[PDB]
Design a protein around this ligand. Structure first.
Ligand SMILES: O=C(O)[C@H](O)[C@@H](O)[C@H](O[C@@H]1O[C@H](CO)[C@H](O)[C@H](O)[C@H]1O)[C@H](O)CO
Ligand SMILES: O=C(O)[C@H](O)[C@@H](O)[C@H](O[C@@H]1O[C@H](CO)[C@H](O)[C@H](O)[C@H]1O)[C@H](O)CO
Lengths: 134, 134
Protein backbone atom coordinates (compact mmCIF):
# COMPACT_ATOMS: atom_id res chain seq x y z
CA UNK A 1 0.00 0.00 0.00
CA UNK A 2 2.94 2.35 0.73
CA UNK A 3 5.91 -0.03 0.49
CA UNK A 4 6.98 -2.14 -2.50
CA UNK A 5 4.18 -3.59 -4.66
CA UNK A 6 4.98 -6.33 -7.19
CA UNK A 7 2.76 -8.20 -9.66
CA UNK A 8 3.18 -10.87 -12.37
CA UNK A 9 5.43 -12.77 -9.92
CA UNK A 10 4.43 -16.10 -11.49
CA UNK A 11 5.54 -17.94 -8.36
CA UNK A 12 4.79 -21.67 -8.70
CA UNK A 13 4.28 -24.43 -6.08
CA UNK A 14 7.68 -25.52 -4.76
CA UNK A 15 9.52 -22.29 -5.66
CA UNK A 16 11.07 -20.28 -2.83
CA UNK A 17 10.44 -16.55 -2.43
CA UNK A 18 13.13 -14.85 -0.29
CA UNK A 19 12.62 -11.34 1.05
CA UNK A 20 15.26 -9.39 2.98
CA UNK A 21 14.42 -6.05 4.59
CA UNK A 22 15.22 -3.56 7.35
CA UNK A 23 13.03 -3.48 10.45
CA UNK A 24 12.59 0.11 11.70
CA UNK A 25 14.22 0.98 15.07
CA UNK A 26 10.83 2.27 16.29
CA UNK A 27 8.85 -0.59 14.67
CA UNK A 28 5.22 -1.08 15.69
CA UNK A 29 4.09 -3.43 12.90
CA UNK A 30 4.82 -4.56 9.33
CA UNK A 31 2.92 -6.46 6.62
CA UNK A 32 3.73 -8.86 3.80
CA UNK A 33 0.77 -9.59 1.50
CA UNK A 34 0.88 -12.46 -0.97
CA UNK A 35 -1.76 -13.69 -3.40
CA UNK A 36 -3.50 -13.18 -6.72
CA UNK A 37 -4.11 -9.41 -6.36
CA UNK A 38 -4.91 -6.94 -3.54
CA UNK A 39 -8.39 -8.45 -3.03
CA UNK A 40 -7.37 -12.10 -3.10
CA UNK A 41 -4.60 -12.85 -0.61
CA UNK A 42 -3.52 -16.36 0.36
CA UNK A 43 -1.26 -14.83 3.03
CA UNK A 44 -1.48 -11.62 5.03
CA UNK A 45 1.63 -11.79 7.20
CA UNK A 46 1.54 -9.23 10.02
CA UNK A 47 4.17 -9.28 12.80
CA UNK A 48 2.98 -6.82 15.45
CA UNK A 49 5.66 -5.52 17.86
CA UNK A 50 3.16 -3.23 19.60
CA UNK A 51 -0.06 -2.68 17.62
CA UNK A 52 -3.81 -3.36 18.00
CA UNK A 53 -3.28 -4.42 21.64
CA UNK A 54 -0.94 -7.19 20.46
CA UNK A 55 2.65 -7.28 21.68
CA UNK A 56 5.32 -9.41 19.96
CA UNK A 57 2.71 -11.41 18.02
CA UNK A 58 2.51 -12.55 14.39
CA UNK A 59 -1.00 -12.35 12.97
CA UNK A 60 -1.88 -14.29 9.82
CA UNK A 61 -5.02 -14.07 7.70
CA UNK A 62 -6.42 -14.48 4.17
CA UNK A 63 -8.63 -12.27 1.99
CA UNK A 64 -11.17 -13.75 -0.45
CA UNK A 65 -12.83 -11.45 -2.99
CA UNK A 66 -12.26 -8.47 -0.66
CA UNK A 67 -13.43 -10.15 2.56
CA UNK A 68 -10.98 -10.97 5.40
CA UNK A 69 -10.98 -14.54 6.74
CA UNK A 70 -10.31 -15.68 10.32
CA UNK A 71 -7.13 -14.46 12.05
CA UNK A 72 -4.56 -16.99 13.24
CA UNK A 73 -2.05 -16.02 15.89
CA UNK A 74 1.39 -17.67 15.84
CA UNK A 75 3.42 -18.92 18.80
CA UNK A 76 6.81 -17.43 17.88
CA UNK A 77 8.36 -13.98 17.32
CA UNK A 78 11.98 -13.87 16.13
CA UNK A 79 12.00 -10.17 15.14
CA UNK A 80 13.89 -7.24 16.71
CA UNK A 81 13.33 -3.54 15.91
CA UNK A 82 16.31 -1.91 14.17
CA UNK A 83 17.59 -5.11 12.55
CA UNK A 84 17.81 -6.91 9.19
CA UNK A 85 15.26 -9.73 8.72
CA UNK A 86 14.89 -12.37 6.03
CA UNK A 87 11.68 -14.31 5.35
CA UNK A 88 11.33 -17.28 2.97
CA UNK A 89 7.99 -18.42 1.62
CA UNK A 90 6.99 -21.48 -0.35
CA UNK A 91 3.56 -23.04 -0.99
CA UNK A 92 1.59 -25.97 -2.32
CA UNK A 93 -2.09 -26.79 -2.89
CA UNK A 94 -2.77 -27.26 0.83
CA UNK A 95 -0.32 -25.03 2.76
CA UNK A 96 2.00 -22.05 2.69
CA UNK A 97 5.25 -22.54 4.57
CA UNK A 98 6.88 -19.51 6.14
CA UNK A 99 10.53 -19.73 7.27
CA UNK A 100 11.73 -17.10 9.73
CA UNK A 101 15.10 -16.03 11.23
CA UNK A 102 16.66 -18.25 13.96
CA UNK A 103 15.27 -21.44 12.41
CA UNK A 104 11.58 -20.84 13.19
CA UNK A 105 8.84 -21.87 10.77
CA UNK A 106 5.09 -22.31 10.60
CA UNK A 107 2.43 -23.46 8.15
CA UNK A 108 -0.67 -21.55 7.13
CA UNK A 109 -3.46 -23.27 5.15
CA UNK A 110 -3.90 -22.36 1.47
CA UNK A 111 -7.52 -21.23 1.96
CA UNK A 112 -7.97 -19.98 -1.64
CA UNK A 113 -6.51 -23.11 -3.29
CA UNK A 114 -4.18 -20.89 -5.34
CA UNK A 115 -1.85 -22.66 -7.80
CA UNK A 116 0.21 -19.52 -8.51
CA UNK A 117 1.27 -16.49 -6.48
CA UNK A 118 1.24 -13.42 -8.72
CA UNK A 119 1.08 -10.54 -6.25
CA UNK A 120 3.15 -9.24 -3.34
CA UNK A 121 2.97 -6.05 -1.28
CA UNK A 122 4.90 -4.72 1.73
CA UNK A 123 3.59 -2.17 4.24
CA UNK A 124 4.41 -0.62 7.63
CA UNK A 125 7.81 -0.57 9.33
CA UNK A 126 9.82 -2.75 6.96
CA UNK A 127 12.02 -1.58 4.11
CA UNK A 128 12.63 -4.23 1.45
CA UNK A 129 16.28 -4.49 0.38
CA UNK A 130 16.26 -7.68 -1.71
CA UNK A 131 13.77 -10.02 -3.37
CA UNK A 132 14.82 -13.33 -4.94
CA UNK A 133 13.16 -16.36 -6.55
CA UNK A 134 14.66 -19.83 -6.01
CA UNK B 1 4.12 -6.68 -19.62
CA UNK B 2 4.03 -10.44 -19.13
CA UNK B 3 7.06 -9.92 -16.86
CA UNK B 4 7.45 -8.63 -13.30
CA UNK B 5 5.94 -5.20 -12.57
CA UNK B 6 7.08 -3.31 -9.47
CA UNK B 7 5.82 0.01 -8.12
CA UNK B 8 6.59 2.19 -5.06
CA UNK B 9 10.32 1.46 -5.51
CA UNK B 10 11.24 4.87 -4.04
CA UNK B 11 14.69 4.71 -5.65
CA UNK B 12 16.47 7.97 -4.78
CA UNK B 13 19.48 9.64 -6.49
CA UNK B 14 22.76 7.83 -5.78
CA UNK B 15 20.95 4.57 -4.94
CA UNK B 16 21.76 1.48 -6.98
CA UNK B 17 19.22 -0.94 -8.46
CA UNK B 18 20.57 -4.39 -9.28
CA UNK B 19 18.61 -6.77 -11.49
CA UNK B 20 19.63 -10.35 -12.20
CA UNK B 21 17.81 -12.56 -14.71
CA UNK B 22 18.02 -15.47 -17.14
CA UNK B 23 18.06 -14.68 -20.85
CA UNK B 24 16.08 -17.30 -22.83
CA UNK B 25 18.09 -19.64 -25.11
CA UNK B 26 16.06 -18.49 -28.16
CA UNK B 27 15.84 -14.87 -26.99
CA UNK B 28 15.00 -12.21 -29.58
CA UNK B 29 14.54 -9.20 -27.29
CA UNK B 30 14.05 -8.09 -23.69
CA UNK B 31 12.92 -4.89 -21.99
CA UNK B 32 13.59 -3.12 -18.69
CA UNK B 33 11.38 -0.07 -18.13
CA UNK B 34 12.05 2.42 -15.32
CA UNK B 35 10.16 5.60 -14.50
CA UNK B 36 7.04 7.00 -12.88
CA UNK B 37 4.49 4.68 -14.55
CA UNK B 38 3.84 2.87 -17.86
CA UNK B 39 3.40 6.20 -19.70
CA UNK B 40 6.33 8.02 -18.08
CA UNK B 41 9.69 6.29 -18.47
CA UNK B 42 13.06 7.85 -17.73
CA UNK B 43 14.60 4.66 -19.15
CA UNK B 44 13.42 2.12 -21.70
CA UNK B 45 16.33 -0.36 -21.93
CA UNK B 46 15.86 -2.79 -24.82
CA UNK B 47 18.66 -5.18 -25.88
CA UNK B 48 17.72 -6.56 -29.29
CA UNK B 49 19.28 -9.93 -30.11
CA UNK B 50 17.12 -10.18 -33.23
CA UNK B 51 14.16 -7.77 -33.41
CA UNK B 52 12.95 -4.81 -35.53
CA UNK B 53 15.70 -5.46 -38.11
CA UNK B 54 18.34 -4.96 -35.39
CA UNK B 55 20.97 -7.50 -34.38
CA UNK B 56 22.95 -7.46 -31.11
CA UNK B 57 22.14 -3.80 -30.36
CA UNK B 58 21.09 -2.07 -27.18
CA UNK B 59 18.33 0.45 -27.89
CA UNK B 60 17.49 3.05 -25.24
CA UNK B 61 14.73 5.64 -25.17
CA UNK B 62 12.44 7.60 -22.87
CA UNK B 63 8.65 7.99 -22.84
CA UNK B 64 7.03 11.24 -21.74
CA UNK B 65 3.25 11.43 -21.27
CA UNK B 66 2.89 8.45 -23.61
CA UNK B 67 5.24 9.82 -26.30
CA UNK B 68 8.50 8.06 -27.20
CA UNK B 69 11.54 10.35 -27.19
CA UNK B 70 14.63 10.24 -29.40
CA UNK B 71 16.12 6.74 -29.60
CA UNK B 72 19.79 6.16 -28.78
CA UNK B 73 21.79 3.04 -29.64
CA UNK B 74 24.86 1.84 -27.73
CA UNK B 75 28.04 0.32 -29.20
CA UNK B 76 28.46 -2.74 -26.95
CA UNK B 77 26.32 -5.86 -26.60
CA UNK B 78 27.63 -8.01 -23.71
CA UNK B 79 24.59 -10.31 -23.55
CA UNK B 80 24.47 -14.02 -24.43
CA UNK B 81 21.23 -15.96 -25.04
CA UNK B 82 20.75 -18.81 -22.54
CA UNK B 83 22.81 -17.15 -19.82
CA UNK B 84 22.42 -15.24 -16.55
CA UNK B 85 22.92 -11.46 -16.65
CA UNK B 86 23.08 -8.73 -14.02
CA UNK B 87 22.36 -5.05 -14.77
CA UNK B 88 22.96 -2.20 -12.29
CA UNK B 89 21.33 1.21 -12.58
CA UNK B 90 21.97 4.44 -10.67
CA UNK B 91 20.70 7.97 -11.42
CA UNK B 92 20.96 11.67 -10.67
CA UNK B 93 19.13 14.73 -12.09
CA UNK B 94 21.27 14.77 -15.26
CA UNK B 95 21.95 11.11 -16.18
CA UNK B 96 21.10 7.48 -15.59
CA UNK B 97 24.23 5.36 -15.32
CA UNK B 98 23.80 1.83 -16.61
CA UNK B 99 26.43 -0.75 -15.62
CA UNK B 100 26.50 -3.88 -17.78
CA UNK B 101 28.08 -7.34 -17.51
CA UNK B 102 31.77 -7.45 -18.55
CA UNK B 103 32.25 -4.06 -16.89
CA UNK B 104 30.93 -1.71 -19.58
CA UNK B 105 29.13 1.38 -18.36
CA UNK B 106 27.14 4.02 -20.24
CA UNK B 107 25.15 7.13 -19.45
CA UNK B 108 21.67 7.99 -20.73
CA UNK B 109 20.36 11.52 -20.13
CA UNK B 110 17.56 11.93 -17.59
CA UNK B 111 14.95 13.61 -19.81
CA UNK B 112 12.21 13.60 -17.18
CA UNK B 113 11.87 15.68 -14.00
CA UNK B 114 11.96 12.73 -11.61
CA UNK B 115 12.74 13.14 -7.92
CA UNK B 116 12.64 9.33 -7.56
CA UNK B 117 12.11 6.17 -9.61
CA UNK B 118 8.91 4.44 -8.49
CA UNK B 119 8.15 2.03 -11.32
CA UNK B 120 9.91 -0.94 -12.90
CA UNK B 121 8.64 -3.37 -15.53
CA UNK B 122 10.36 -6.21 -17.35
CA UNK B 123 9.16 -7.79 -20.58
CA UNK B 124 10.25 -10.26 -23.24
CA UNK B 125 12.85 -13.01 -23.14
CA UNK B 126 14.19 -12.22 -19.65
CA UNK B 127 13.24 -13.99 -16.42
CA UNK B 128 13.98 -11.95 -13.29
CA UNK B 129 15.64 -14.01 -10.53
CA UNK B 130 16.78 -11.31 -8.09
CA UNK B 131 16.17 -7.62 -7.43
CA UNK B 132 18.24 -5.67 -4.89
CA UNK B 133 18.25 -2.05 -3.68
CA UNK B 134 21.64 -0.62 -2.78
O1 LIG C 1 -7.31 -6.93 17.55
C1 LIG C 1 -7.95 -7.85 16.98
O2 LIG C 1 -8.00 -9.02 17.44
C2 LIG C 1 -8.67 -7.54 15.70
O3 LIG C 1 -9.27 -8.73 15.15
C3 LIG C 1 -7.69 -6.91 14.70
O4 LIG C 1 -6.59 -7.80 14.49
C4 LIG C 1 -8.31 -6.52 13.35
O5 LIG C 1 -7.36 -5.75 12.59
C5 LIG C 1 -7.10 -5.99 11.30
O6 LIG C 1 -6.59 -7.29 11.05
C6 LIG C 1 -6.27 -7.55 9.69
C7 LIG C 1 -5.80 -8.99 9.53
O7 LIG C 1 -6.78 -9.88 10.00
C8 LIG C 1 -5.18 -6.58 9.22
O8 LIG C 1 -3.97 -6.83 9.91
C9 LIG C 1 -5.62 -5.13 9.43
O9 LIG C 1 -4.55 -4.26 9.14
C10 LIG C 1 -6.12 -4.89 10.86
O10 LIG C 1 -6.73 -3.63 10.96
C11 LIG C 1 -9.67 -5.82 13.47
O11 LIG C 1 -10.55 -6.37 12.49
C12 LIG C 1 -9.61 -4.30 13.31
O12 LIG C 1 -8.89 -3.70 14.40
O1 LIG D 1 14.21 0.73 -36.34
C1 LIG D 1 14.19 1.82 -35.72
O2 LIG D 1 15.18 2.57 -35.64
C2 LIG D 1 12.93 2.24 -35.02
O3 LIG D 1 13.17 3.43 -34.26
C3 LIG D 1 12.43 1.12 -34.09
O4 LIG D 1 13.40 0.86 -33.06
C4 LIG D 1 11.07 1.45 -33.45
O5 LIG D 1 10.78 0.51 -32.41
C5 LIG D 1 10.30 0.81 -31.20
O6 LIG D 1 11.29 1.37 -30.35
C6 LIG D 1 10.83 1.73 -29.06
C7 LIG D 1 11.95 2.42 -28.30
O7 LIG D 1 12.38 3.55 -29.01
C8 LIG D 1 10.33 0.47 -28.33
O8 LIG D 1 11.39 -0.46 -28.17
C9 LIG D 1 9.20 -0.16 -29.15
O9 LIG D 1 8.75 -1.35 -28.54
C10 LIG D 1 9.68 -0.45 -30.58
O10 LIG D 1 8.60 -0.90 -31.37
C11 LIG D 1 9.92 1.49 -34.48
O11 LIG D 1 8.81 2.22 -33.94
C12 LIG D 1 9.46 0.10 -34.93
O12 LIG D 1 8.36 0.25 -35.84
Amino acid sequence: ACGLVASNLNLKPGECLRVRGEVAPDAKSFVLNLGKDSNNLCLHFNPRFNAHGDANTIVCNSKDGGAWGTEQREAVFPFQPGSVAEVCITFDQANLTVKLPDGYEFKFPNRLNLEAINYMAADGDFKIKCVAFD
